[PDB]
Structure formats: structure tokens, C-alpha cells
Amino acid sequence: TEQEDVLAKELEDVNKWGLHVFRIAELSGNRPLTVIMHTIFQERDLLKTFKIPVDTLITYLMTLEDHYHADVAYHNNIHAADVVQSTHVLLSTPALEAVFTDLEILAAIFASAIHDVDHPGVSNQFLINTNSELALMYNDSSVLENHHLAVGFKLLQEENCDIFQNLTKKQRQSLRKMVIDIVLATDMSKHMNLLADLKTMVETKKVTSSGVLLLDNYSDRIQVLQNMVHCADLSNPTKPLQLYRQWTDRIMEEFFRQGDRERERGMEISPMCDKHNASVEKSQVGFIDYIVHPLWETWADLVHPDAQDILDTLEDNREWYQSTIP
Template sequence: SYEAENGVSPGHTPLGSQSPSLTLHPSFPQGQRRESFLYRSDSDYDMSPKTVSRNSSLANGYLLFCHFNRRSPLGGVCVSPRASLSDQQYQQLALDTLEELDWCLDQLETIQTHRSVSEMASNKFKRMLNRELSHLSEMSRSGNQVSEYISSTFMDKQNEVEIPSPTLKDKSMSHISGVRKLSHSSSLSSNSMPRFGVNTDHEDELAKELEDLDKWSFNIFRVADFSNNRPLSCIMYAIFQERELLKTFRIPVDTFFTYVMTLEDHYHGNVAYHNSLHAADVTQSTHVLLSTPALDAVFTDLEILAALFAAAIHDVDHPGVSNQFLINTNSELALMYNDESVLENHHLAVGFKLLHQENCDIFQNLTKRQRQSLRKLVIDLVLATDMSKHMTLLADLKTMVETKKVTSSGVLLLDHYTERIQVLRNMVHCADLSNPTKTLPLYRQWTERIMEEFFRQGDKERERGMEISAMCDKHTASVEKSQVGFIDYIVHPLWETWADLVHPDAQELLDTLEENREWYLNTMPQSPSPPPDRHLQHDRFQFELTLEDLEHNNHNHIHMRSKELEGEEESKEAEMEENEEEEEAAETKENEEEEEGETEEKVEEGEEEEAGETEDAGGEEEEKVEVGEAEEEEEEEETAEDEADQEEVVEEEEEEES
């Protein structure tokens, strides 16, 4: 478990009680729901004596306590309380010790070790995911493709590729590409404003759909149908109205609509997934997550404004291809942003650049300090939507969950700005990865759209003679298996951790996620077994560990190697014994064959002799037979003559009698 690897969470005592200085929500019973790979420990993969000893002694680790002097927290002598203390004294000592541990944790927080803890957690999760993906890649070709996609997309790994030489262009890169001059009426006012901010003939139907604005089951596809294909403009207006953000930040209504319509027009309608519909969906999902009871009154109005604005612009001017595609094709954007979060940087640049167009500055009435704070926060949130940063975000969130502080009413205590930003960063990331947690009909539509976008990229790569990216080859990709892997290794661990943070507010989402996984699992076609040909092994995707991972696992590798050597020696001994037995069996067989050969030779010789004797005997017998036959003929002739004589005598006697 996470605790077994990183220590017992603050607030948990060996007696099952909670520390008086920290109140935690009891987690939902883990036995009721499938756990993600995060709850596995390194010992599940490594059975070295050190690891086994460490884990096996964990349960007994609280049998000894060190009694510290309160003035000198690092001093003290370990004693065995059972040997000299009563049960009551033992329990009191345990509680005192935990208070000292709380003090130590506070000191660690003070010296800001959080970053290093998160980094350790991130490295650990990457190692665990590497092992899971390595196992998946060995199962089948489609499993290998899913593993490669997850690793290359969500683990901040850059594959070595042959980048074409840059071609000289006269086109200047000093401007932000993608920004177009659009003419939206700036004469809108609250008097002439349509009911939902968009011109539509289906106001009643749209009104009915917007009644579910605060629900996770909200159907953004129907909103797009009833809003004249203006889902982002409609959703932004509805949310800003409900939260009174237009009033709070004195945003003119006509300016607001000029900006959001211009923003929506900069999403590409011919891109299957990363279009204004996706932006509207992420914005509405962020709105629902901001309303989570556990986060009530945690964030300021400016932070809420920043989160919603970031969600709205987070994929603007998306070309429908991945960061890696832009890097591999030596695109202008990749050159401009030095291959680092290429699209995310571009989305930010376009989103902020549009504020400078005519009557588009929705933040015109913010103070300079508010504007600076909002810009910094929005940049942080949009950059967090780079999927290659997923493991780092997950590690940060998991670390926060393990050390979270709540009030007696269950509201999170996020005292510092950095803590609130960390939660917002993960919130927008969760909203961006929320499709599998929606109802199955919605989820399936999103899946069809993302796969269509992937396949279009694969076609472009095929036309250019490039290696086709994982899950982008329409001839080989397994849609069902990709979704099961996506849920198991990315979505489930993230939402499971978020659900722990806001417990019990996200339990229904986890249930829906599990149901959707089961549906895709049951519709998954039977994958063919991997080919036995060893020459195909080089096609398997290789998962490389970082230098830190190698150093961290060095002793494990040494032990595993020693185990392998021992196993090899045992195998060799077994092989030697088998060889000896085989040799003995072979010798016995040879002896038997030799004996059989000798017997056969003797038999053959005997047969030859018998054949010779038989031939001689046959000749003599033939002669004897011929002589015998002649004698028999003579005897028969004599007998016949005698019989004839007798007949004559009889006839004569009969004549005489007559």
C-alpha cells in the first residue's frame, strides 16, 4: 500500500485512533471497489530479503517507541514499553509519541520538503506504471500498442526520432499564429442580448438542458444542437451568470460575448475531438468540481474566474495533432516553444492575444495586481493540461491526500496559495480526463471522436512516410483495449485519488467509471496470441527507466540478478542431472540396440545357415519325394493289377457257380 511504502499517514495511530491534531475523513472501504495500481507496493514486484524484512516488520514496528524530550525532539532513548509499563502507560506513551511525530511533520512542512516528497512519489508511480505497461506489452500486439501510447503520452518521455532539417522561411515568427480578425457585433447590450447569449430557435429545449448545468450527467451534445453550434459561448454565459462573475468583476456583457464568440471561432470545427465542444465540456466539468461540498468556500472569486477561463481556452486553435507530431515534423510552433508543451503554450498565447482584439478585454476592470495574479494562475492551469505532466500531477495530488487537513465539517483546509493552486491544477486536469466518468452514451461519443482524430493523424504520418504513432493506425488499433488500458493506468488512479481528497463527494463517478470499463472490457474482441517467432521481439515497445529509477532500484537489480544466478545454477544442476539421466538412458538404449543388433546378426546368420541347410535338405527331400512318388506309382500299378486279377478270379468263380 501507499502507507507501507511511504510511512503511515499523519493521523493514524497504532491503536487505530486518530491524532488529536489532525482530523481525517475515513476512506471508503477499499474492498468494495477495485483499487488502482497505486495501491501496490514495490514489494509486490521485488522479493529481496531487505524488502521482505522491511514489510514484514512494519506491523510490529510500533511495538517499540522512542520517548523524546519535548525540548529536544531529536534526542531520546528507545525503550520497550511492554517490558516495564502498564497498558495504560503504554497507550499514553504511544499518544505522546504521535504528538512528537506530528511536531516533526510540522517542522518538515516548515522547511518545505513537500516538493521532494512529491518527486519521490512521482518517481515511484512511474516505476510502478512502467512495470504494469511492460507486462501489458508482453500480452499481445494490441497491448503493446496501448502501452506505447500511454507511456509516450502520459509519462513525459521523448522518443528518439529523426527530425527533418529545417527549411528557411521568410515568414516571421514574431507574431502569434492562429489569431484571426473576426467581426462580431460590439453593439450587444443587456437589452438586446438573447436569453442564453446565442441566437437559436430552440430556446425552450436549450433551457431544459441548462437545468442540469450543475450535474455531472449534463449532455453537452444536446446543448450544441440547441445553441446553433455555440456550446462554449452558451456554457460560459450560463456559468458566469450563475456565479455572478460578470457582476463581481464588472465585465460588460457585450464585451464578454464578443470575446467568447471570438474564442469559440478560433476552435477548429473540422477537428474531431479538440474543438469548442470539448472546451465547453471541460468548462462545465470544472464548474461542477468547483461546487464540490468539500471545497466549499476554499477558493477566492479570482481563482474561480481563472479556473473557468483556463478551461475555456485550454485547447483553442488545436490543429488536431499531438505535440510529438509537431516536434517530429519540425513545425513552426515546436521551434517557437522549444519542443516544450508546444500546444499548451500556443493555446495560452492565443487565448490571451484575443483579449487585445476590439471589445474583447473581459478583464479590463480588474486591478493591475488582480490581472497579474489571474494571468499567472491561468498559465499554470493550462500548462497542467499537458498530458506528459500527468504523473507529476498525480504524485502531487496523492501526497496531498495522504497529508490532507480538514475541519470538523469536512471542508479541506488549504491555507497556502500553493496548496489551492495545486488542487485547481489537478481539478482542471481531472475535468480534461473526465470522459470515462460520464454516462456510457456520452463516453462512447467522446471515444469515437478522439479515435477519429488519432486516425487522421495516423493518415498524415502515413502520407509523409513517418512512423505511425501508437493508437493512430486505423488498421491495427484496438479501440476497446485502448479504453480499458486508459482507464486502468491513467483515469482510474487519478479519479481514485481525487475521490479520496473530496470524500465522499465523488463516489458515484468511480462507480460509473467501473461500469464503463466493464462495458468496454466485455465488448473487447479476443486478441490473438503473440507470435512465437523470436525475431519479432525487437518490435516490442521498450520501457526505459530514468537514471534516478536505476539508482533507486540498483540494490533490487543486484539482488534480482543474484537470484537469477542462483536460479541459473539450480537450473544448471537440474539440467546436469537430467543430462546424466539422459546419458544413462542413452547408454542403456545403445547397449540394448547393440544387443539387438548382435541378436539380429545372429538371427540373420542362423537364417542364412538354415536357409542353406533348407536348400540342401530341400534338394534331398525333392529327390526322395521323386523316388517315393515313383515307388508309389509302381505300388499303385501293382495294386491295380492285383485288384484286376482279383476281379477276374471273382468273375470266374461267379461264372463257375452259375
């Protein structure tokens, strides 16, 4: 049909920063995670390399996508599809050419795919303060992140869902460790420590004459992949304004719902969660100045000069939001 044709046309931009992910979600019948993952797996030749039966891949991905909540405005299948595709573009950065193996590329993409699965739309601190079963289970540390990992891996055991069935036992062990390491690093309470170590690597940075990153041990390699997916998770303000504003609208809607829960329980309403006392534009400038820019400037330095266009878009967007403040 015309819908399938226009979908295939949008997917041609899968290697570009600024893919029309919302449009893809609409055209695919709300299956952006399934179709983008499938497209990326074919593009990187990941099915033949790891002998993943195509029917097995689709079955797992549709199941995975079903476990992201439709009624959660930001942390849903669209956010997952976006982080996956953003990770995919960062992996193709010239400074990282031939740096990671096929197993590490699969780990980073699969981790991005599951990184927020089954998100209930409330934060770690909210789950802790409300004496929830999740926080009780995970002893108050990376409560959501440990949960997203458990569900992402448990789903592989459903009928015809084990996409890793043809990997060796050692390959399975290695991928699992890498995925756990990456998803735990998406907990914002770890942001400051990741960034500091990223800056340390930037100072001691070793490269070839063409500027390709030389990363020999696990510690250095997993550190770059953790920051890569972390950067993808914090990529909304670096995308074309039309996309960023939509993400902003969704996170504010999610945060206000949490704030509405906090108000009726008699709790102190969390930052940016009070719809009656908000400053959406100031909060975005604050988000860029204190979190997103310091991270992306450091990443830019690691892969100089390949991230220059991403950084320019970030500063343009910051300038625009600032202008909306009287």
C-alpha cells in the same frame, strides 16, 4: 422559438455531471462554449462581481469559440465547453466549499475555456517530429499548451473583448499567473508528477470537522486547481456511457487522421493512430486502468466522499468496455 426554449431547458442541468453537451451544441447553432460559459458566469454572479459588461463577455466568447477548429473531431469548441462545465461542477464539491476565492474560480473556468484553443488535431510529439513552426517557437516543451495560452490571452485585445478591464492590476497579474499554471498542467507529459504530488497532499490532508479542505498557501491551492482542470480534461470515461462513447468516437477519428499524415510521410505511426491495426476497446480499458482511474481514485480520496458517484460511473463504464472484448 421552440429551439431556444429547449436550449434553455437543457441549460438547467448546468450544475449536473452528465449535461447533454452535444445536444446543446446542436440547439445553439454550434455555440456550446459561448452559451455554457455565459450561463455559468450568470450562475456564479461573475459579471457583477468583476464588473464584466455583458456585451463584452459575449463578444470575447464568440471570438474564442471561432478559434477552435470545426474540422477537428475531438479538440474543438464542444470539448472546451465540456471541460468548462466539468470544472464548474467540481468547484461546487462540498469538500471545497468556500475554499477558493472568486478570483481563483474565474481563473479555473477561464483556463478551462481556452485550454485547447486553436488545436490543429495533432499531438506535441507529432509537431516536434515534423519540425513544425510551433515546436520551433516553443523549443519542444508543452508546444500546444503554450500556444493555447498565447491565443486565449491575445484575443482579449480584440475590439470589445477585454472581459478583465475592471479588474485591478494586481487581480489581472494574479489571474494571468494562475491561468498559465493551470493550462500548462493539461500537457499529459506532466500527468505522472501531478498525480504523485496529489497523492502526497492526500496523505498530509488537513480538514475541518465537516471535511472541508484547508489550503493556505499558493503552492497547495494552485496544485488542487491544476489537478481539478486536469481531472475535467480526463472526465470523458466518468460520464454516462452515451456521452463517453461519442467522445471515444471523436478522439479515434482525430488520432486516425494524425496516423494518416504519419503514414504518407513515412513516419512510425503513433499509438492508437493506425486505423488498419487498432483495438479501440482494449485501448479504452488501458486508458482507464493506467491513467483515468488512478487519477480519479486519488481525487476521490481528496474530497471523500463527494466524488463517489463519478467513480462508480467510471467503473461501470470500464466494465462495459471490457465486456465488448471477446
